[PDB]
Design a protein around this ligand. Sequence first.
Ligand SMILES: CC(=O)N[C@@H]1[C@@H](OP(=O)(O)OP(=O)(O)OC[C@H]2O[C@@H](n3ccc(=O)[nH]c3=O)[C@H](O)[C@@H]2O)O[C@H](C(=O)O)[C@@H](O)[C@@H]1NC(C)=O
Ligand SMILES: CC(=O)N[C@@H]1[C@@H](OP(=O)(O)OP(=O)(O)OC[C@H]2O[C@@H](n3ccc(=O)[nH]c3=O)[C@H](O)[C@@H]2O)O[C@H](C(=O)O)[C@@H](O)[C@@H]1NC(C)=O
Ligand SMILES: [Cl-]
Ligand SMILES: [Cl-]
Ligand SMILES: [Cl-]
Lengths: 360, 358
Amino acid sequence: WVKILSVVGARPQFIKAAAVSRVLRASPGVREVLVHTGQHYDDNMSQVFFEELEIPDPDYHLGIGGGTHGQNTGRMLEAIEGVLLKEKPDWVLVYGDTDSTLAGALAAVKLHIPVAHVEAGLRSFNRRMPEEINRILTDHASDLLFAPTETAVQNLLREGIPENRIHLVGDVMYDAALHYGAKAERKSRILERLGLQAKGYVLATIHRAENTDDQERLRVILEALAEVHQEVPVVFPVHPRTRKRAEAFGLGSYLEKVVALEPVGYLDMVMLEKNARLIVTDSGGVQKEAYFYRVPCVTVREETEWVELLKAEWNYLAAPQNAKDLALTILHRMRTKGVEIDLYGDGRASQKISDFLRKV
Amino acid sequence: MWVKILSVVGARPQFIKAAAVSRVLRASPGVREVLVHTGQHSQVFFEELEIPDPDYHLGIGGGTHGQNTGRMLEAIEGVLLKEKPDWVLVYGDTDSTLAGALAAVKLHIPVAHVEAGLRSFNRRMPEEINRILTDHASDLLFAPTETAVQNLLREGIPENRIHLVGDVMYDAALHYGAKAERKSRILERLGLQAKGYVLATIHRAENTDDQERLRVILEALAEVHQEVPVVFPVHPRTRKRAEAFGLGSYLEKVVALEPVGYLDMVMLEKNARLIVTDSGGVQKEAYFYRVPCVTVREETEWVELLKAEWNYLAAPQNAKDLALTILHRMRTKGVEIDLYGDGRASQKISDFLRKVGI
Ligand SMILES: CC(=O)N[C@@H]1[C@@H](OP(=O)(O)OP(=O)(O)OC[C@H]2O[C@@H](n3ccc(=O)[nH]c3=O)[C@H](O)[C@@H]2O)O[C@H](C(=O)O)[C@@H](O)[C@@H]1NC(C)=O
Ligand SMILES: CC(=O)N[C@@H]1[C@@H](OP(=O)(O)OP(=O)(O)OC[C@H]2O[C@@H](n3ccc(=O)[nH]c3=O)[C@H](O)[C@@H]2O)O[C@H](C(=O)O)[C@@H](O)[C@@H]1NC(C)=O
Ligand SMILES: [Cl-]
Ligand SMILES: [Cl-]
Ligand SMILES: [Cl-]
């Protein structure tokens, strides 16, 4: 048998790990160990993902979070190593691009434990972004690089990573949407709770530091969504950090002018995404999900790593410079669509991953 | 024009590199330096380098990679938040190096890597990962060799961030040569004459943490000693391992010493017939003095020394074979060639740090 240990720190990593774990559980000589590093350690940011997505309780919860980059990363590196020394996994899988991701990779490679990066080779080319540093360092530390796009493959080849370590497997978050979609239909009643008609609202999520730590950007965003809301209802599950910033800068009243919610579980999120007329976000996962449901998307950033979405016209960049401009862009984009194209694979990225963790 | 340049150093070879750089930075009064020592607070060997005492001793060491690295990352960041330097300099390829780079980059403090782009292409070595990741985290890459330059370019690091400045350890050797000649009495003390001995240092974990591999080395040196005396300043950790494994009697069969200071090291190296080492710095220094070298490893990053035939790899598989290799190479010389720059790597580094821009 082979032991495959997964390190997960945050909501989007739990969702990626859910897809992979589902395939590895069904595999003959594979034992899974799951380490939760403690970054997201809430109900609506963590536990709801474990229950709804049928993820077995983590074997370890490290309880680390809320410090500086150096504190969080340093403590995680030591604590993850401690677990690796006990468990002696044959593979460590790390996901996405947070400090957890880097800490796991760095803990493993120094113990000569093979590392594979799920969602490898994404680049913003903005080296000041902490996650840009994280994915670069993770990718160079890894033994296997599971890229979701051709752009990701090209990015890894450009940095001298050898072709035989890189596999274009598609996106496990597509696997997740495809596999949990029926379940979301059979359990979520969020549209009824909120009194929404299918295709009678816009859905917004905003959590990037660039957008929430800069008062003028966050004011543009919140004023824009209030304007949009007068035309078409805006539903907004608000990230807790985003809520705290809006309150801190005196912008809380804008949340009261839309249908602002606390963060929702994945099943409700699927139902909201599926039924939205348009999605406005700065989330990586959410902009891909918009495309999964063929809902037009606006990404409130100067760039995205998911460039194929822009090229296929499913997604559109709108930097938050002016509230009225952003509102008008949102309104205009909601009656657009992109081209016919199949991105991110067949929904079996996870069994491709599993197969490679046998063969290599 | 007032800029603060903070240097992160772990062990001996990093102090020697940082000393070379700091001797040049001291010539710019608008440059304030801060020196952060990641280990504990000997103070003589320290002073031969003409460096002020460290501003900080974080006192981290003796654990696993994850412990040492994780503790250092958090402690270095703490200092950076206090000191708010304009530049962080990291040196070489240890866990201290990577911890300093990681601490800085996430605070948006520019990092320069002294000794950038070296590659073994074997990730069994922790230092390989360390230097790859440090390089990809760095704003300025100070490469010692053309090979290092080509390694950095192949990994997609842009040309305008890479500078071939040569090796600060050649600067150091050039700077301290005369003082060593004037002040060192080690040959007199040991009873050796020029070209009458072989010098050995061994400190790599892979060579000292396996009983039978360390036995191969110590037995080889005992055999060599029967033909030509072997002078062996033993790294303290090498001696601890040797004692723990029950191999200490082998140290009595050569001229085993405690670690020596830099000036005495210059004198030993310069006057040796052959140097046998697993040190990166000593490999180069053997070449500086045109003394043949045998590297007790499966690879070296300093590949120019192999091509110029000044160095030769002898993995420690068999005591007899390693001894014979050592004795055969003692009668060799490499080709005349100018590696590692003009002794002014440190000046080039300082020039780049001071003009790069905010
Ligand atoms: C630093 C950064 O922002 N890195 C990116 C970051 O992802 P994301 O931005 O997508 O974070 P999120 O938006 O918090 O979660 C979305 C999910 O929550 C669900 N979601 C959303 C809201 C909600 O209320 N309920 C939900 O279930 C949605 O349905 C989605 O399934 O972290 C990822 C990771 O480390 O794995 C990186 O892969 C990633 N990098 C890229 C390039 O996409
Ligand atoms: C992991 C590893 O072994 N990395 C390498 C490691 O250096 P080295 O192997 O040279 O360590 P050392 O041999 O302990 O010191 C030599 C000096 O001590 C003097 N030395 C020596 C013995 C003595 O008794 N007295 C002395 O004065 C000698 O005269 C020398 O000047 O750490 C360096 C660093 O991080 O900066 C890396 O750049 C380097 N990687 C390469 C590629 O060379
Ligand atoms: Cl969010
Ligand atoms: Cl289609
Ligand atoms: Cl040594």
